[PDB]
Amino acid sequence: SEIQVLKAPRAVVWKDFLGVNAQFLWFSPERYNKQIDRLQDLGLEWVRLDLHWDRLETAEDQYQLASLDQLVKDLEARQLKSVFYLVGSARFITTAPFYSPFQDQYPPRDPEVFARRMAMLSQRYPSVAAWQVWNEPNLIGFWRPKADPEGYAKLLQASTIALRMVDPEKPVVSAGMAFFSEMPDGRTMFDALGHLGVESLGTIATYHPYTQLPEGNYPWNLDFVSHANQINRALRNAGVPAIWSTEWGWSAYKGPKELQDIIGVEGQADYVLRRLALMSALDYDRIFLFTLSDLDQRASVRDRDYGLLDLDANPKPVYLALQRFLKVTGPKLRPADPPVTEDLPDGSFSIGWTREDGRNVWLFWSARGGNVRLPKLKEATLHDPLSGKVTPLSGSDGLEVPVKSSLQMLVWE
């Protein structure tokens, strides 16, 4: 019946667990403060932000930090917890060959130079919650001309030492690896780094498992939970202090298709909730949805519509759905089992939790559907986070429940 039942390894406190990627430096403080209001309205506080070196040290030893000073101050005033990741080579340090069109997509000639920047940043901004080293080094667009475990490892080592020199308590996060860390030559960056003793550094491990569907790449092989469980298991076995997922999500873009199938604002709201349901029941210590806001032409066409909010900072359907979802769940969930069922359709997903008020929450869906019987329940409340619909249900000798392709939530006891 290919039914997939998930039970989480620990309690989930949404405020601690679920954060968002952000792109604040591309917005006025009036605009990003509005975005913050919306984030706070969800009960969340963690944000993740890039720091493109080439755009910050615009000439050797010359920095344009005025707006980043302001942002960091604003983030602190708004009580948000932030992780920044420094990525790309400034031109003076790049390993790019002469006349390269993308010098910054090459790594630094000397990792110590990069590491000294991370130390400068950590000192300048003590409020930042965590510091991340580079980004998706397994992907050619971030590390030319070839993925290089040895070199990323040196960069990571240098940066870790420098970051702990400034604050030995403050977490150091390794690069979020593209996808499940796969490299073009067939290796995985997680594997390759493991053979190099990277665990010695004790950095937080993280990857960016984008897939075509919330549960996998193909409708006939929803193997996301398997792959994820496999990777995290291996990460824990290797001695990582924590596992994050610093990026995941879908774009509402109309196209033309570039890798991701066109699913629109509604498909975004649907997919995002279904994947949130999975990931929050898997072995992650923290995840970051991509991303808080839609973006303008400074971003690729597809990248413009990953937002929870539009360019005016108004909720998109995904935001409204997520809000409904979080309201039903409450602030904290404790692992539980699903209700006992009869005739759960094949391919169903089933996840059980208990709320703060002690009531249970069942999260379920299936691509096929039909109904399911809950023999022991006499009463329950059905929620469809996508429509906003709430259906009180009553059974003398059990309830019947419709299964949709999209996530629904049942509040029962």
Side-chain angles (χ1 to χ4, degrees), residues 362-411:
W362 187 34
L363 313 174
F364 64 108
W365 64 90
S366 176
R368 296 283 291 152
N371 300 322
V372 50
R373 187 162 102 84
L374 270 49
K376 303 267 161 280
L377 278 178
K378 243 96 121 116
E379 242 183 299
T381 301
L382 182 63
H383 293 264
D384 177 351
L386 296 197
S387 54
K389 195 172 272 153
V390 179
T391 310
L393 297 175
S394 248
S396 78
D397 307 85
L399 309 176
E400 290 261 86
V401 184
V403 183
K404 296 176 183 283
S405 59
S406 52
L407 171 150
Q408 286 177 293
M409 321 173 68
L410 191 71
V411 182

Side-chain angles (χ1 to χ4, degrees), residues 187-336:
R187 308 189 272 165
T188 79
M189 180 76 70
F190 280 145
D191 281 354
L193 290 181
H195 291 316
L196 293 171
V198 164
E199 59 271 354
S200 311
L201 301 170
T203 59
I204 292 176
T206 168
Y207 54 107
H208 299 169
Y210 290 97
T211 61
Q212 191 80 251
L213 308 168
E215 319 96 339
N217 276 314
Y218 311 98
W220 58 83
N221 187 17
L222 305 195
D223 65 355
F224 173 82
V225 169
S226 293
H227 200 171
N229 284 339
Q230 171 187 107
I231 304 298
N232 306 154
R233 267 199 307 259
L235 289 162
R236 298 286 182 194
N237 278 325
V240 307
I243 311 178
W244 298 1
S245 183
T246 41
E247 290 182 30
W248 59 273
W250 291 264
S251 168
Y253 78 139
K254 309 196 149 270
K257 176 185 187 177
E258 184 249 319
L259 259 25
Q260 188 209 284
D261 277 305
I262 306 313
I263 65 171
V265 283
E266 291 302 328
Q268 179 191 20
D270 176 26
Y271 283 26
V272 160
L273 263 51
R274 273 190 273 150
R275 177 69 87 80
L276 173 62
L278 297 184
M279 299 189 69
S280 76
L282 295 175
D283 196 17
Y284 298 105
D285 299 282
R286 182 171 294 130
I287 63 178
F288 294 79
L289 166 73
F290 192 96
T291 189
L292 182 44
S293 185
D294 288 343
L295 302 170
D296 67 11
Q297 131 180 280
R298 275 169 291 188
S300 80
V301 173
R302 170 165 60 116
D303 276 7
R304 294 166 202 183
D305 303 294
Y306 277 93
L308 287 173
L309 316 169
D310 63 27
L311 278 176
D312 300 304
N314 297 329
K316 291 159 58 173
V318 62
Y319 177 98
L320 294 179
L322 175 55
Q323 186 173 43
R324 286 175 200 118
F325 174 96
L326 292 173
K327 267 203 52 195
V328 165
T329 65
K332 178 178 179 184
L333 287 171
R334 290 165 290 169

Side-chain angles (χ1 to χ4, degrees), residues 54-88:
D54 188 50
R55 308 181 201 170
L56 292 166
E57 200 175 346
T58 46
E60 188 165 0
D61 305 325
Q62 168 191 96
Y63 306 81
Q64 235 91 31
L65 303 177
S67 77
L68 180 62
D69 289 342
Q70 192 52 72
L71 175 60
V72 166
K73 271 167 26 48
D74 289 350
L75 295 174
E76 190 187 31
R78 304 300 304 272
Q79 314 198 283
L80 304 187
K81 297 176 171 56
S82 53
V83 55
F84 282 89
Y85 68 92
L86 179 66
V87 63

